[PDB]
C-alpha cells in the first residue's frame, strides 16, 4: 500500500482516498495510533504544545512587524 | 363485444367496519401496539394495490374514489358561488370594473381581524380576491347575484348526486373488469362526446347569452337594464338587431353560406381595446372549431362493428429496424397497470396547466383582466406550481409501477428492453450535459457580478457589455409579427402584441405591449433550461434504477419505499426511488421559484405600469440589473420588500404576518431535515422513564418515526414555508403597487 498514515497502517491499507481522509482525521488521535506507549505519547503532546506556542509567537511578531511596516 | 357488465349488491352498508381501524389491510387490522401503527394506517388507507389483488375491485375502489373527488370539487365551487352571491360587491364592480376591487370575503367584528375588511370600492369592506371571479362572471355575463345563488344551489345538488353515485356504484352495483377494459369504447365515447359536446354547448351559451349581454356591457348600457337571457332566446328580434344574420335564422347554415354569419364568427385577433378581453366573436369561433374537431374525432376505433381501428394492431404495426419488437405488448401493459395510465396522465396534465397559464397571460380573455396585474400573476404562479407537482407525481407513480407491476417475461426485446440495456450510457450523457449547462449559465451571472465588484463592467455580459442576443427568439417574434400578411391573409391582428406593434390601454393601466428580449432574458432562459434538465436527471435515475443497480442487484426486492439497506459496504443511506422523487421535489421547487421570479420582475419592469409614456413599475431596471445577481437581490427583492415590511396597521398587515410565519415554519422543517430517528428514540426512552417514574406511561408504545416518514414531514414543511413566504410577499407587493 502507501505509507498513507504511518501511525496507522490499517488506514494506510485502504485502496481508496478514504485512506487519505482518515489518515488526516486521526493524525492527532495518538491514543489510537499504533503501538503508542504512555511516556511516548506524553512527549508527543509535549512537542505539540511547543509548536503551539511557536505558532502564537509567530502570529504576534508578524502582526507587529507588518504594522510597524505599513501602519499609521 | 362491448356491452355493460356489472355485479349487483357486491358490498353491504354498515357502520361496523367504521368502528374497526385498519380493517382494509391485513396487519393494521390487528390494532395498535406502538405509535407508528396509526401513521401507517393513515399512510396505506388508499393503497388499493396493498389492500388486495383483485384488479376489478381495485378499479371499483378508484371509481368510487373519483366519484367522491368530483363531489368535493362540486362542494367547493358551490360554496365559492354562495359567498360570491352573499358577501360580495360584484354588482358594484359590474357598474364599475375600473375602480372597484373584486372582494368576496368579509370577516367578523372581533378582537381585531376586523381591520382587514378594507375599502375596495363601492362602500364594500372585505378582502380583494385575486381569483378573478368578477371578470369571469362578466365574461359569462352574470348580472344578478340571484344567478350566483341559483348556481351555488345547483352545485350543492350536483355534489350530493355524485356522492350517491359513488355509494351506489360501490355497494349496490359495481361494474366488471372487462367492462372497465373496453378501452376503445371509452376512448371514442370521451373523445367525441365529452369534449365536443362541452365545447359546443359552451359556444351556444356564448352565442345566445354572453356575446349579446357582453356586447351590451361594452355598449355601456346599465347592467340592470339588459333584458333577460331567456327573454333574448325568446325574441329573435333583438338578436337580429345585434346581428342581422339571425333574421335569416339557420337556413343559411343549411345552405352553407357561412360567410353571412361572419357578424359573430370573426377573425380579428387581438383584444377588445375598450375592454382588454379577447374578441368574443373570435372566442366563440374558437370554441365551435374545437367542438367540431373533437366530435369528428370521437369516431376512430372499433367497438361493436366491423369499421374502426385496433390500438393493439397499429402499435404492433409500428416497428422500426433499429428497434427490434417496436411497439409490441405495450397494449398488454397499459391494459393492466393503473400506475401506468396514472403517471402518463399526470405528466401530460402538469404540462397542460403550464401551457394554460402561459397562453392565459399571453392573451388575456377576460374583461379588464389585464388590468388586474395581481390576478394575472396569482393565477399564473398558481397553475405553474400545480403543473410541476403533477409532473413529479407522474414520475412517482411511474416508478411505483416499475417496482410493482413490472414483468420481464412479456417484454422480451422492446423499446423498454433496450432502454434497460443502455440506460448507463443514457444517464451518463445526461449527467455531462447538465453539468455543462449549470457551469456556463451560472458562471455567466457570476462573472458579471465579479467584473462589477472589480469595477470592470466593460467585461461583463450585458446587453451593453458582451452580448448574447436571442436572435432566434427575436427573429421568430418578428416572423409572427409579419405572418398575417401572407401566411394568414384572412387575419386582422396578430394573436399577441408581444409579436410586435402598439400598446393597448384600458384605464391608464398597461394592458399589453410588445416585449423585447435581451441578453438578460437569454441568460434566464438558459438558467431555466439547466434546472429542468437537472430535475429530469434525478427523476430518470430514480426510475431507471428503481429495480436494480450495479450496487444493488436486487433493489426490486426492497419494495418501492424503504429507508436503506444498512450502513454496510459504505452505507446504503437514501437509496430508494422514493428518495429520488424526494430530491426531485427539491430541485423542482428551486426551478419554479426561479421562473416566477423572472416572470414577476420582467413584467414589472418592461410590461406593467400606467400609460400617460409608460410609467413602468420598476422602470425597466431589470434590463440592466438582471445581468448581475447583486442587482437581482437589491433592485428586485430588497426594493419590492418595502410593501410587505411596512404593511402593518393596514388591512394587508396579515401579509407580513404570514410572511414571518412562513419563515418560521420553513426553518422548522429543518430539524426533521437534519436529525436522526435513532437519537429521537433515545430521547423517547429517557422521557418514558420520566413518565413511568410517575406511572403515566401510555399503553401505545411511543416510537420515533421511520426514516422515510421523517424525510416526508420535513420536506412537506419546508416546501410549505418557502411557497408561503413567496406568496405573501408577492400578494402584498402587488396589491400595494398595482
Amino acid at each position: 500500500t502507501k505509507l498513507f498514515p504511518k501511525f496507522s497502517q490499517g488506514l494506510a491499507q485502504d485502496p481508496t482516498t478514504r485512506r487519505i481522509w482518515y489518515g488526516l482525521a486521526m493524525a492527532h488521535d495518538f491514543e489510537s495510533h499504533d503501538g503508542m506507549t504512555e511516556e511516548n505519547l506524553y512527549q508527543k503532546i509535549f512537542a505539540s504544545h511547543f509548536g503551539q506556542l511557536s505558532i502564537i509567537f509567530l502570529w504576534t511578531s508578524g502582526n507587529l512587524f507588518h504594522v510597524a511596516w505599513q501602519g499609521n | 363485444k362491448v356491452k355493460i357488465a356489472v355485479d349487483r349488491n357486491p358490498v353491504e352498508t354498515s357502520f361496523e367496519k367504521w368502528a374497526k381501524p385498519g380493517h382494509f389491510s391485513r396487519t393494521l387490522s390487528k390494532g395498535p401496539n406502538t405509535t407508528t401503527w396509526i401513521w401507517n394506517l393513515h399512510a396505506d388507507a388508499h393503497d388499493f394495490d396493498s389492500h388486495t389483488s383483485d384488479l376489478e375491485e381495485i378499479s371499483r375502489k378508484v371509481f368510487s374514489a373519483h366519484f367522491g373527488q368530483l363531489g368535493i370539487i362540486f362542494i367547493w365551487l358551490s360554496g365559492m358561488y354562495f359567498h360570491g352571491a352573499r358577501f360580495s360587491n360584484y354588482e358594484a364592480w359590474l357598474s364599475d370594473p375600473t375602480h372597484i376591487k373584486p372582494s368576496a370575503q368579509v370577516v367578523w367584528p372581533i378582537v381585531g381581524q376586523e381591520i382587514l375588511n378594507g375599502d375596495v370600492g363601492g362602500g364594500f369592506q372585505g378582502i380583494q380576491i385575486t381569483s378573478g371571479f368578477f371578470q369571469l362572471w362578466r365574461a359569462s355575463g352574470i348580472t344578478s347575484e340571484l344567478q350566483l345563488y341559483t348556481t351555488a344551489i345547483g352545485g350543492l345538488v350536483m355534489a350530493a348526486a355524485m356522492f350517491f353515485a359513488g355509494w351506489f356504484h360501490y355497494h349496490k352495483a359495481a361494474p366488471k373488469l372487462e367492462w372497465f377494459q373496453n378501452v376503445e369504447s371509452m376512448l371514442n365515447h370521451h373523445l367525441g362526446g365529452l369534449l365536443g359536446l362541452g365545447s359546443l354547448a359552451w359556444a351556444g351559451h356564448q352565442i345566445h347569452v354572453s356575446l349579446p349581454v357582453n356586447k351590451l356591457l361594452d355598449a355601456g348600457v346599465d347592467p340592470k337594464e339588459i333584458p333577460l337571457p331567456h327573454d333574448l332566446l325568446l325574441n329573435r328580434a333583438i338578436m337580429a338587431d345585434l346581428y342581422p344574420s339571425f333574421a335569416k335564422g339557420i337556413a343559411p347554415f343549411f345552405t352553407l353560406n357561412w360567410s353571412e354569419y361572419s357578424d359573430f364568427l370573426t377573425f380579428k385577433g387581438g383584444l377588445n381595446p375598450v375592454t382588454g378581453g379577447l374578441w368574443l366573436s373570435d372566442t366563440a369561433h374558437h370554441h365551435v372549431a374545437i367542438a367540431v374537431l373533437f366530435l369528428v374525432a370521437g369516431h376512430m376505433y372499433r367497438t361493436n362493428w366491423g369499421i374502426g381501428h385496433s390500438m393493439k394492431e397499429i402499435l404492433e404495426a409500428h416497428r422500426g429496424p433499429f428497434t427490434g419488437e417496436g411497439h409490441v405488448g405495450l397494449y398488454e401493459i397499459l391494459t393492466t397497470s393503473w400506475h401506468a395510465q396514472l403517471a402518463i396522465n399526470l405528466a401530460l396534465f402538469g404540462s397542460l396547466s403550464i401551457i394554460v397559464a402561459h397562453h392565459m397571460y399571453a392573451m388575456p380573455p377576460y374583461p379588464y383582466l389585464a388590468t388586474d396585474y395581481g390576478t394575472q400573476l396569482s393565477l399564473f404562479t398558481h397553475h405553474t406550481w400545480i403543473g410541476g407537482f403533477c409532473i413529479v407525481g407522474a414520475g412517482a407513480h411511474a416508478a411505483i409501477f416499475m417496482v410493482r407491476d413490472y414483468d420481464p417475461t412479456n417484454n422480451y426485446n422492446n423499446l423498454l428492453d433496450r432502454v434497460i440495456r443502455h440506460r448507463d450510457a443514457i444517464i451518463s450523457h445526461l449527467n455531462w450535459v447538465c453539468i455543462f449547462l449549470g457551469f456556463h449559465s451560472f458562471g455567466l451571472y457570476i462573472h458579471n457580478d465579479t467584473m462589477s465588484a472589480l469595477g470592470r463592467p466593460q467585461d461583463m455580459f450585458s446587453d451593453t457589455a458582451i452580448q448574447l442576443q436571442p436572435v432566434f427568439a427575436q427573429w421568430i417574434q418578428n416572423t409572427h409579427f409579419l405572418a398575417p400578411q401572407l401566411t394568414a391573409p384572412n387575419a386582422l391582428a396578430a394573436t399577441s402584441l408581444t409579436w410586435g406593434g402598439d400598446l393597448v390601454a384600458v384605464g391608464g393601466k398597461v394592458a399589453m405591449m410588445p416585449i423585447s428580449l435581451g441578453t438578460s432574458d437569454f441568460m434566464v432562459h438558459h438558467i431555466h433550461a439547466f434546472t429542468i434538465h437537472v430535475t429530469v436527471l434525478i427523476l430518470l435515475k430514480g426510475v431507471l434504477f428503481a429495480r436494480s443497480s450495479r450496487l444493488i442487484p436486487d433493489k426490486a426486492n426492497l419494495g418501492f419505499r424503504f429507508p436503506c439497506d444498512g450502513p454496510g459496504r459504505g452505507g446504503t443511506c437514501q437509496v430508494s426511488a422514493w428518495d429520488h422523487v424526494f430530491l426531485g421535489l427539491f430541485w423542482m421547487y428551486n426551478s419554479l421559484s426561479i421562473v416566477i421570479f423572472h416572470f414577476s420582475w420582467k413584467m414589472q419592469s418592461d410590461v406593467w405600469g400606467t400609460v400617460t409614456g409608460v410609467s413602468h413599475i420598476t422602470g425597466g431596471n431589470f434590463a440592466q440589473s438582471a445581468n448581475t445577481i447583486n442587482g437581482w437581490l437589491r433592485d428586485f427583492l430588497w426594493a419590492q420588500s418595502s410593501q410587505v415590511i411596512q404593511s402593518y396597521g393596514s388591512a394587508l398587515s396579515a401579509y407580513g404576518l404570514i410572511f414571518l410565519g412562513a419563515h418560521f415554519v420553513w426553518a422548522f422543517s429543518l430539524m426533521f431535515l437534519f436529525s436522526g430517528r435513532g437519537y429521537w428514540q433515545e430521547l423517547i426512552e429517557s422521557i418514558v422513564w420520566a413518565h413511568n417514574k410517575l406511572k403515566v406511561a401510555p399503553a401505545i408504545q411511543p416510537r420515533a418515526l421511520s426514516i422515510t416518514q421523517g424525510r416526508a414531514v420535513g420536506v412537506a414543511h419546508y416546501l410549505l414555508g418557502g411557497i408561503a413566504t413567496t406568496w405573501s410577499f408577492f400578494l402584498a407587493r402587488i396589491i400595494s403597487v398595482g
Partner: protein
C-alpha cells in the same frame, strides 16, 4: 460427494447482452462463474438487469462479485429448485468454483462442519474496553 470442477465449454444461456457487464476488475483481480443444469429451456431475469433464457441442462455464466451469483442462486433455487455450483476464478486461470461449495447447502446441519468464530458464552459477558487498551491496534472487547 466430492468437489466438482469447472468446464469452460458450457453453452451459456440465451441473453441479448447488456451494459451492466464485467469490468477491468474481472481481467485484473478475479471473477466468478456459475454452473447449473436446468431441467428445461426457460426465460429468466438477470440479476444485473435483463431478461435471459436458460438452455436445457448445462448452462454457464460468469460474474465479478459474489453477491450477483448468490442472489442468482436464490432465484433459481427458490423458483426452479436448481442446485447450482459456482466457483471463484482469477485471471491466472485458477478456479475455486466455490460460493456455497460444501457438499450440500449450509441451511441444514451437516456432520463435519466445525464451529468457527462462535463465542461459547453469552454476549453480556464481555469486558470493558479499558482493558483492551494499549494493544497493537484498535481491538474490540468482543474480539476476545
Amino acid at each position: 460427494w466430492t468437489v466438482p470442477t469447472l468446464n469452460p465449454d458450457t453453452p451459456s444461456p440465451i441473453f441479448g447482452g447488456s451494459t451492466g457487464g464485467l469490468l477491468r476488475k474481472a481481467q485484473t483481480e478475479e471473477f466468478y462463474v456459475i454452473t447449473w443444469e436446468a431441467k428445461k429451456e426457460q426465460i429468466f431475469e438477470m440479476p444485473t438487469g435483463g431478461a435471459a433464457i436458460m438452455r436445457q441442462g448445462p448452462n454457464l455464466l460468469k460474474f465479478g462479485k459474489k453477491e450477483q451469483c448468490l442472489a442468482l442462486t436464490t432465484q433459481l433455487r427458490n423458483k426452479f429448485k436448481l442446485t447450482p455450483c459456482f466457483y471463484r476464478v482469477f485471471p491466472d486461470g485458477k478456479v475455486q468454483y466455490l460460493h456455497p461449495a460444501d457438499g450440500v447447502y449450509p441451511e441444514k446441519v451437516n456432520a463435519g462442519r466445525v464451529g468457527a468464530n462462535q463465542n461459547m458464552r453469552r454476549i453480556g459477558q464481555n469486558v470493558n474496553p479499558i482493558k483492551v487498551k494499549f494493544s497493537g491496534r484498535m481491538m474490540s472487547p468482543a474480539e476476545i
